[PDB]
Structure formats: C-alpha cells, structure tokens
Amino acid sequence: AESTLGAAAAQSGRYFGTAIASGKLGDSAYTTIASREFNMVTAENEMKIDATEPQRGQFNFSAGDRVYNWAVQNGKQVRGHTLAWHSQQPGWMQSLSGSTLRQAMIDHINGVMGHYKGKIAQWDVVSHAFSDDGSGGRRDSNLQRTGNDWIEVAFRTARAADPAAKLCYNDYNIENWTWAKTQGVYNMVRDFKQRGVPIDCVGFQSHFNSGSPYNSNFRTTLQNFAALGVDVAITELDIQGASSSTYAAVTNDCLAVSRCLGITVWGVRDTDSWRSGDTPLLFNGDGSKKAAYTAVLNALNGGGQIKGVGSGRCLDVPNASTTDGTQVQLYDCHSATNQQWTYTDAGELRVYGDKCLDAAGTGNGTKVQIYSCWGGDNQKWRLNSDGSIVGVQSGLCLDAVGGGTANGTLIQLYSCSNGSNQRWTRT
Ligand SMILES: *[C@H]1OC[C@@H](O[C@@H]2OC[C@@H](O)[C@H](O)[C@H]2O)[C@H](O)[C@H]1O
C-alpha cells in the first residue's frame, strides 16, 4: 500500500503517526483523516500525569482509554506519554518534593503502566529533563531536586512495571548535533547503556521553526544515538510553514536510520495544532492535503518547463505577459522565461519570480492563470507521482481544456481522471 502515510511508512517497517485529542474524536472530518492516514497514535494530553492521576493515588483513565481504544480499534499502535516530567503535573504533585516526590513518581509510573501493561509499543518514561540555557545540564525542577538519579530510577521502575514496552527518553532542541543540550542527552544515554540502565529509545520532539531550525545534521544526531544501541523516534514533528523540502528532509532522515522506528507529527490538521499560527502540519483546517503531504508521501514511497504528456507542449504564459488574470496555455516548448516554472517550499508554481500559477475558483472549468503570489491555497499545488498536478484548495487537477493539444489550448481545473491532458513531466 502506498496512498496513505502510515501504509507508505509500513513498506519499510516503520510507522507514521499523529497526536490524537480525545475531544476531537466526535469530529467526523478529524477522524476520517486520522483513521485513514496514521498507524501510530500518541494521546496529546490524556495519558499525562494530571490527566491520569488528578488526585494522589486516584487514577483516572477515562480519556486515556478512549484514545487508546480508538487507536487499537482503528489499527494503530500506541506511544504512551508521559510518565514522569516537570510539566502538566497535577496541583498536588507540584507541591511535593524530596523523598515523598520520588515515591509519588514511582507510584504514578506503576499505576499508569500497570493499567496499560503489555498494550503499549513505546512509553516516553521521562521527557524534557534538560535545560536550554546552553550548559547541557539538567532542567531545574521538583523532580530534579529529588536527586540527579530520578531519571535512572524512573526507567528502572518502568522496565519492571511493563517489560514489553520500549522505554524512551524524549526531549526537544536535541536535534542539532552541535548544541550543548543534544550532547547532554547523548552523554546521559551513553552512560545509561554502559551501566545497564534500561532504556530502549530516544525520542526527538522535532519542533522546527525559525527560532530552532531544522539542520541536516539531525540525521547525524539520529545515527549517533542509534550507534549507542538504542532505537530513535521522531515524536512531535511539526515544521513552521510546513515547508515541503523540510518535511521531505526529515522523512528521509528517518528512512536513512535503520533504528528509526517511525515519525509522529504533532496533530492532524493545522487547526488542531498547539501552534496553529505556524500552520506546521500536513493537512489544512478544511481537511485538504498540503503540498508537504505529497512531499512526505513521495519520500516514504522511495521517490524548469512543465510539459504536457498528451500534447508534448509546455505550460506557457501567453506572449510572456506578466498581467494578473492571464490564463495559461499549452505552447511549443522553447527557451523563454514565460515557460520557466519554479516549485517552492510553500507549494507554489512561480514564474517571473513573483507571479503564481493561480486557480480563479474551485470547480470544474475554473480558469488557471498567473496572479501575484500571496499565499492562498488556490496558488498551492501538489505534484503527484503519476504526473498530475492537483490544486490544494480545489482538489482538482491541472487540465488542458477539452483534451486540446495544439498551441493556445487553455488550462483549467478539472476532476482528476488520469488522462494524458492532466499528466505533466518536469525535465
Ligand atoms: C512535546 O511538546 C508538545 C507537548 O504537547 C502539548 O503539551 C501542552 C498542551 O497544552 C498541548 O495541547 C499539547 O499539544 C508534548 O506533551 C511534549 O512531549
């Protein structure tokens, strides 16, 4: 199978997952996409400490079980998270400290893991334990104040609680190999493996934006950790603006590491994101697949002028016009700027540098023209492996009107048909 993300990843023994919010399971649009595209689920908040143990010794798995059951019933494995960390702690735990906090941490781990014993693929036992001050040291938290060995203890407790689950340490800003934080985690994990501390995986949040940009050395980081004898997982992937190249790059980084179990994007649609303003996911709020979706699918499947297959002619802007609203056409291919299209990270097909292939509407027969670039979804396109070019907003294919092949044949949007007048080659 290769038409959905999860299935595409499965071809190499990997998964492609998402974060599921129990509060959205009653949303048909949400579940239709989530059940179809992902084969791994992480509860966005339902399995955290405050959600599972609202009162000391009083566990509640109502929300957690709804996410877990939805996942398994729809064919997805589950990553549990998170058993012990400084954030989202219930009020009672925040006030605890020292030895009492240490015991509370242990009791929580046993309670939650015991409830899901043998049903969880991976557990983020500890998360976000290192600082961002640039010292590569531990984060100052109530948990850290109970002893630097709290993390080690958490893992030993976890292994005993459920020996069938892979135990992971998860964190962010540990993707770039040159950062001190990355080194701090690397050294801790190396020490753990050397001393026999039970740890099976390292999770990389992979939250990329201009403040903490993706860097190609992420692959090196993954490979260095894999070399320590642990699996690695991309746990909360999201990319500011959802750059197609960056999404494909991260996808290929996991594919390049034998021990990379899979990739989880932090949310289904941009509107479901904890950082929606950065439209960092693979689906738009209206459910349409973004340019990055196709880039990722293509990568998982192991994947200038734009020439029509049926006509042998090139996508051309009539008389090299730069006027907004000029409908594009098919024309004999030749070296000219009005036939030179550039596919951008945002999914646009640009010409002249700042003009965009633009759909004047959303239905069959819609005029395809050039228009000033502004970021609209009617200016975004997905380059399918079969040669078709689909509009993100419309879901319709670039189509040479009436199947025409002669110079002057206009271009429109039309229901995809796999026809030769809808197939294009880029060379
Ligand atoms: C990685 O970062 C994102 C965390 O998830 C968010 O936590 C805060 C919630 O308010 C928000 O809804 C969640 O998406 C995740 O737990 C971390 O591991």
To test the pocket of ligand 1, the residue of 22, 47, 266, 281 to mutate (highest count of ligand atoms within 8 Å of its CB) is: 266
Q: Atom 7 (ligand 1): residue with closest C-alpha?
A: 45
Contact between 78 and 119 under an 8 Å Cβ cutoff? The reply is: yes
Q: Give the CATH number of the domain where residue 212 resides.
A: 3.20.20.80
User: CA-CA distances (angstroms) from residue 424 to 327, 419, 421?
Assistant: 18, 10, 8
Contact between 24 and 272 under an 8 Å Cβ cutoff? The reply is: yes
User: CA-CA distances (angstroms) from residue 193 to 196, 227, 228?
Assistant: 5, 11, 7
Hey, which residues does 383 pair with through a beta bridge?
389
Give me 312's structure tokens: 């042998």
Looking at residue 313, its amino acid is R
Looking at the fold, whether 32 and 156 belong to one and the same domain comes out as yes
Looking at the fold, whether 65 and 179 belong to one and the same domain comes out as yes
d(CA 213, CA 266): 17
Residue 10 buriedness (CB in 10 A; 0-12 / 13-18 / 19+) = middle
What is the resolution in angstroms? 1.7
Looking at the fold, whether 281 and 323 belong to one and the same domain comes out as no
d(CA 128, CA 218): 18
Residue 274, ligand 1, Cβ within 6 A: yes
Contact between 79 and 40 under an 8 Å Cβ cutoff? The reply is: yes
For residue 267, how far is its CA from the centre of ligand 1 (angstroms)? 10
Hey, which residues does 167 pair with through a beta bridge?
123
Looking at the fold, whether 10 and 124 belong to one and the same domain comes out as yes
d(CA 29, CA 176): 36
HEC per residue, 274-299: CCHHHCCCCECCCCCECHHHHHHHHH
d(CA 379, CA 382): 10
d(CA 151, CA 147): 9
Looking at the fold, whether 58 and 125 belong to one and the same domain comes out as yes
For residue 86, how far is its CA from the centre of ligand 1 (angstroms)? 12
The verdict on whether 236 is a catalytic residue reads yes
Say which residues have a Cβ less than 8 Å from residue 302's Cβ, sequence separation at least 6. 11
Task: Give the CA angle between residues 341, 342, 343 to the nearest 5°.
Answer: 120
| 205 CA closest ligand 1 atom index | 1
User: CA-CA distances (angstroms) from residue 183 to 89, 131, 188, 235?
Assistant: 27, 12, 9, 19
Residue 386 buriedness (CB in 10 A; 0-12 / 13-18 / 19+) = exposed
Looking at the fold, whether 294 and 327 belong to one and the same domain comes out as no
| 274 CA closest ligand 1 atom index | 14
User: CA-CA distances (angstroms) from residue 380 to 12, 319, 339, 349, 350?
Assistant: 30, 24, 18, 7, 10
d(CA 328, CA 152): 63
Last residue of a domain, one of 274, 300, 326: 300
Last residue of a domain, one of 244, 279, 300: 300
Say which residues have a Cβ less than 8 Å from residue 150's Cβ, sequence separation at least 6. 84, 102, 105, 143, 144
Give me 266's structure tokens: 């932090």
Looking at residue 282, its amino acid is L
How would you label 215-242 residue by residue, b for 16+ Cβ within 10 Å and e otherwise?
Answer: bebbbebbbebbebebbbbbbbbbbbbb
For residue 305, how far is its CA from the centre of ligand 1 (angstroms)? 43
Residue 59, ligand 1, Cβ within 6 A: no
Query: In 3D, which of 221, 193, 188 has the Cα closest to residue 206?
Result: 221
Contact between 199 and 171 under an 8 Å Cβ cutoff? The reply is: no
**Strands 342-343, 329-331: pairing kind:** unpaired
Contact between 369 and 358 under an 8 Å Cβ cutoff? The reply is: yes
To test the pocket of ligand 1, the residue of 274, 275, 278 to mutate (highest count of ligand atoms within 8 Å of its CB) is: 274
Helix, strand or coil, per DSSP, at residue 360: coil
Residue 277 buriedness (CB in 10 A; 0-12 / 13-18 / 19+) = exposed
Element (H, E) at 329: strand 329-331
Gap sites in the chain (C to N > 2.5 Å), preceding residue numbers: 303
d(CA 319, CA 190): 64
| 19 CA closest ligand 1 atom index | 14
Looking at the fold, whether 210 and 105 belong to one and the same domain comes out as yes
Last residue of a domain, one of 246, 279, 300: 300
How many Cα atoms sit within 13 Å of 319 on the Cβ side? 3
- Residue 148 is classified by DSSP as T
Residue 24, ligand 1, Cβ within 6 A: no
Find how far residue 236's CA is from the centre of its chain: 7
Looking at the fold, whether 277 and 369 belong to one and the same domain comes out as no
- Residue 43 is classified by DSSP as E
For residue 117, how far is its CA from the centre of ligand 1 (angstroms)? 23
d(CA 76, CA 44): 15
d(CA 338, CA 351): 7
Contact between 350 and 341 under an 8 Å Cβ cutoff? The reply is: yes
**Strands 77-84, 122-127: pairing kind:** parallel
Structural domain boundaries, residue 263: 1-300
Say which residues have a Cβ less than 8 Å from residue 136's Cβ, sequence separation at least 6. 130, 180, 181, 183, 184, 187
Looking at the fold, whether 274 and 370 belong to one and the same domain comes out as no
Give me 425's structure tokens: 């080659």
User: CA-CA distances (angstroms) from residue 39 to 7, 70, 141, 281, 369?
Assistant: 8, 12, 34, 17, 39
To test the pocket of ligand 1, the residue of 18, 41, 45, 172 to mutate (highest count of ligand atoms within 8 Å of its CB) is: 45
Domain count, the chain: 2
Find how far residue 117's CA is from the centre of its chain: 27
Query: In 3D, which of 96, 72, 66, 71 has the Cα closest to residue 84?
Result: 96
Q: Atom 15 (ligand 1): residue with closest C-alpha?
A: 44
Find how far residue 403's CA is from the centre of its chain: 38
Looking at the fold, whether 107 and 184 belong to one and the same domain comes out as yes
**Binding site listing for beta-D-galactose:** 316, 319, 329, 334, 338, 399-400, 402-403, 421
d(CA 378, CA 356): 10
Give me 260's structure tokens: 């990379």
For residue 413, how far is its CA from the centre of ligand 1 (angstroms)? 39
d(CA 345, CA 214): 14
Residue 127, ligand 1, Cβ within 6 A: yes
Distance between first and last Cα of the chain: 28
Looking at the fold, whether 290 and 313 belong to one and the same domain comes out as no
Contact between 284 and 377 under an 8 Å Cβ cutoff? The reply is: yes
Residue 205, ligand 1, Cβ within 6 A: yes
Hey, which residues does 17 pair with through a beta bridge?
40, 264
Residue 46, ligand 1, Cβ within 6 A: no
Q: Experimental method for this entry?
A: X-ray
Contact between 206 and 275 under an 8 Å Cβ cutoff? The reply is: no
| 172 CA closest ligand 1 atom index | 1
For residue 279, how far is its CA from the centre of ligand 1 (angstroms)? 16
Q: Give the CATH number of the domain where residue 330 resides.
A: 2.80.10.50
User: CA-CA distances (angstroms) from residue 156 to 82, 89, 116, 265, 422?
Assistant: 15, 21, 17, 29, 58
Looking at the fold, whether 295 and 338 belong to one and the same domain comes out as no
d(CA 385, CA 293): 12
